[PDB]
Design a protein around this nucleic acid. Structure first.
Lengths: 206, 117, 57, 117, 122
RNA sequence: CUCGAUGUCGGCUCGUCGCAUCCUGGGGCUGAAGAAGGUCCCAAGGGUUGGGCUGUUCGCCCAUUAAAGCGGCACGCGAGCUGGGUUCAGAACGUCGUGAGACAGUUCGGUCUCUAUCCGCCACGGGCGCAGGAGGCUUGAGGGGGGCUCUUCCUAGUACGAGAGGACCGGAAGGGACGCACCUCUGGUUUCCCAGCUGUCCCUCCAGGGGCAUAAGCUGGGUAGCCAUGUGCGGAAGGGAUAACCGCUGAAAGCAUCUAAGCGGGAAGCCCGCCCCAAGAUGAGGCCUCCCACGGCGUCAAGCCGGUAAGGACCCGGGAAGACCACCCGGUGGAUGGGCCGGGGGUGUAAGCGCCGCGAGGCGUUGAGCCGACCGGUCCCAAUCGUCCGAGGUCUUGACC
């Protein structure tokens, strides 16, 4: 239970007798680019690609890695374990049925470098009776002979945007089998018009 | 392709025209009935009149606060396609300049001024 | 206010000055005459790819 | 906060527009001019749109960019002097190109950029 | 939209359509005398006669001004801030009051009386 | 140790461990019917509100709350603030003093500096390596993040019950607090997007504009990006060992006992399951594809040169990625930028001429005009030409050819 995708954009829709908002998932259809047979990679699983960026551009290696079970002419590829390939090509034109619950993730839009301000919560310090730092700045960092020094792992300023992550459950809402697309009402995990993936896990007993 | 494309599409799918009703006009206080309901599916062709205020525009859009003097000032904001709607008929005039968010209205209005426009 | 303590020898000084280090200048030959041309550029001779419009006076 | 950013420039919007123009003008004068890396880049974008109306060719358009450069000599100078010369291509009437050196004291990389004949 | 300390409006048997609430009656961590909620307060404004007084009740949330966003994507905002005063149980304060309709209220429900009570223009 | 120097309060901000645990649960006990209390042992998991007055932490008081703990770290925090404080001179009196002056009586003011070297933390890179030289997909030992809880409603007043009184099993529903993403929607911004305006010197008088009227003079609205007060989501299951505490089978105490023997019950806690790092885990790299076992040199050739574009680097040009850097897609056999164009969404009917008014302006051609980041067309322009480095890919053993 997994879908590979080019995440489109977020937008609003309606359901039953009320509007609410969704997101645009789009995925041509990855294919058995590589299989870890188990005897192969006893971490058995399926690795696939789902599109194709120019052919005149392509390392030999790629060319033949493909050769393998041979498939097509793309570059978007990655892998996931414990997921059979009751096919040798997958789309979602059904692959992913709506009115179902899902879990999913993607690249995480890339922030900047902001301290106690950003990075973490609590917006900085205070402002007025003190302005030799006006409004916000760095909290405190340890002490005299307690550990006798500077700590080792509390939040910290800077770069906190160039990373990746995911979201737990979300809704499958709707399936557009033609233009391999699906509306899901999602935390648009990470950008849009870029890269994402979906997987489904949740033996959740309410 | 991309966004523009595909999306344009899905929406077209659901909203279709918000129900061809393309009577915007800046001013015009006017009146409609939304399904707005509850209690024993009392979805009521409820009609509120309101002096036309603003709007959101693209797939999702909204015929904005049209302020209505109820006996206190109550401004009503409503999504456009939003299947929620049934009747939507204008009464007032699509006049006045400076464009929307002209809350001048709701704010310092004063019936007189109001008419002053 | 915070003047170090001593200087971990030239040793250190280097450690630093060192990772520092000075690299060299990119160049191929004039798409026209000869000598060194950095990627997109012309110069006091050839000066072009389609109209020297440059050099000599 | 910052990242996804469009129209990227330096100094101060007034200073800038100032330049963009002054320069757009001087180039118009000489067909080709010498300055620094993006000085050119963006100046391209700009003097760029200008030639665009240069072409526009009409009482109005005229009125406009003039609005911006202020001065007949050139006004017409461009609008008829070369505006024709170009009226027929698909813009990009700019040719921004990296010279041989960098101004002194600093090594500021520069170039010449002009109307692309 | 909300507030802790508040100069709010009412219009029940009010001493004055105004009282200052401390905070929200909800899940121990107030911070929002929010639309259709129930909270705490004392009077701020005067009161000709009236058995009301300069005390303090608790009650329920009307109007707001900063997004009445409903389930049906019904949307509204009144340039007014006020709720109805409660007597214990919730059972409203006065015989009547100056204001009207709209989901959020009835929806919260517990106060039908308020419900049929403030109907017409105003 | 300290007087060649160790900043004392109160508070702030970021807190970190601790249990004699407050709320949480697990419990045997009751003078335990129910419910509810109260009585100890186990267990820190998360959690462990606002104001008032007081320079006071303590405290007393308002309102809630599941609850609104004690305390370790120079009563954590000045190389991170604050500085009411008590504690340099003033002056004040109240009080001693023959008075000079004085009172840990008091009250009004009362010049807190900081360009980081080291180890330490937060990030990001340059090495050189995990004995072919390579492009890309993985699996994790091991480490990191979050594990709360209301009130209502579900079975609720049949448990208890003379009666007054109250359910374990268990099951819902939403909410608060909070963590993670994210703009559609909601609202916030938008130094140039558009629109209105006074004063002013300039263009050429008239309009039509132009710089200055603070780094946009004023004002009213305003994408896109970023962003709450807006949106999705999360804190689970469920698996295995157990704390107190409950039992089974059974002696040594030829009746008995949970008890060494052997077996089970059992906690929101411990390992896992949940996401996020990760072989520089020298103890991996596992798998895929691919150039050749590359070419010359004194045998030990683990050195040289081409070798391969096998591949990549360089420069260029582009990027919600971004201090540099590395990451990322592209370089014209392209759409990469800017340009242009169609379009969205912005402003609110232009400029001119035309129509009514001495005029002010009003109406028409006008919902025109002008536009920046948003969908995407099209080589209009500029991604030319080139250069360099990069196998013949650890030791070892066994096996086949």
């Amino acid at each position: 239970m997994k879908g590979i995708l080019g995440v489109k954009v977020g937008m609003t829709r309606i359901f039953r007798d009320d509007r609410a908002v969704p997101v645009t998932v789009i995925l041509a259809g990855p294919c058995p680019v590589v299989q870890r047979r188990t005897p192969e990679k006893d971490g058995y699983t399926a690795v696939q690609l789902g599109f194709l960026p120019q052919n005149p551009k392509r390392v030999n290696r790629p060319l033949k890695g493909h050769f393998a079970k041979a498939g097509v002419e793309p570059v978007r590829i990655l892998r996931e374990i414990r997921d059979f390939n009751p096919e040798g090509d997958t789309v979602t034109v059904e692959i992913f049925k709506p009115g179902e619950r899902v879990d999913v993730t993607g690249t995480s839009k890339g922030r900047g470098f902001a301290g106690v301000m950003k990075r973490w919560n609590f917006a900085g310090g205070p402002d007025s009776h003190g302005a030799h730092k006006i409004h916000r700045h760095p909290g405190s960092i340890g002490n005299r002979k307690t550990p006798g020094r500077v700590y080792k792992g509390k939040k910290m300023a800077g770069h906190y945007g160039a990373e990746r992550v995911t979201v737990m459950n979300l809704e499958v809402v709707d399936v557009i089998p033609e233009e391999n697309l699906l509306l899901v009402k999602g935390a648009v995990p990470g950008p849009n018009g870029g890269l994402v993936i979906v997987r489904e896990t949740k033996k959740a007993a309410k | 392709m991309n966004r523009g494309a595909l999306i344009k599409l899905v929406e077209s799918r659901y909203v279709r025209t918000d129900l061809p009703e393309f009577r915007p006009g800046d001013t015009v206080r006017v009146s409609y009935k939304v399904k707005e309901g509850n209690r024993t599916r009392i979805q009521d062709f409820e009609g509120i009149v309101i002096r036309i205020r603003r709007n959101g525009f693209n797939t999702t859009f909204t015929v904005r606060k049209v302020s209505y003097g109820v006996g206190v000032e109550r401004i009503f904001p409503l999504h456009s396609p939003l299947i929620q709607k049934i009747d939507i008929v204008q009464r007032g005039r699509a006049r006045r300049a400076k464009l929307y968010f002209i809350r001048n209205l709701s704010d310092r209005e004063i019936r007189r001024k109001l008419r002053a426009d | 206010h915070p003047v170090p303590k001593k200087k971990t020898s030239k040793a250190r000084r280097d450690a630093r000055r060192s990772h520092h280090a000075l690299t060299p200048p990119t160049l191929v030959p004039c798409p026209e005459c000869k000598a060194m041309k950095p990627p997109h550029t012309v110069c006091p001779e050839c000066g072009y790819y389609a109209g020297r419009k440059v050099l000599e006076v | 906060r910052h990242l996804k950013s469009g129209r990227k420039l330096n100094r101060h919007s007034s200073h800038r527009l100032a330049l963009y123009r002054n320069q757009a003008k001087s180039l118009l004068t000489h067909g080709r001019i010498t300055t620094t890396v993006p000085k050119a880049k963006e100046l391209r974008g700009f003097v760029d749109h200008l030639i665009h109306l240069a072409k526009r060719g009409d009482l109005h358009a005229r009125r406009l960019v003039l609005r911006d450069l202020q001065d007949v000599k050139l006004v017409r100078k461009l609008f008829d002097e070369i505006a024709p010369r170009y009226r027929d291509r698909q813009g990009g009437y700019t040719r921004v190109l990296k010279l041989a050196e960098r101004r002194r004291g600093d090594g500021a990389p520069l170039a010449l950029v002009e109307l692309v004949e | 939209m909300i507030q802790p300390q508040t100069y709010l409006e009412v219009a029940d048997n009010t001493g004055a359509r105004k009282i200052m609430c401390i905070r929200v009656l909800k899940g121990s961590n107030a911070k929002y005398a929010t639309v259709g909620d129930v909270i705490v307060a004392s009077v701020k404004e005067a009161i000709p006669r009236g058995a009301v007084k300069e005390g303090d009740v608790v009650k329920a949330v009307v109007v707001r001004t900063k997004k009445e966003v409903k389930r049906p994507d019904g949307s509204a905002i009144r340039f007014d801030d006020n709720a109805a005063v409660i007597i214990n149980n919730q059972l409203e304060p006065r015989g009547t009051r100056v204001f009207g309709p709209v989901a959020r209220e009835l929806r919260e429900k517990g106060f039908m009386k308020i419900v049929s009570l403030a109907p017409e223009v105003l």
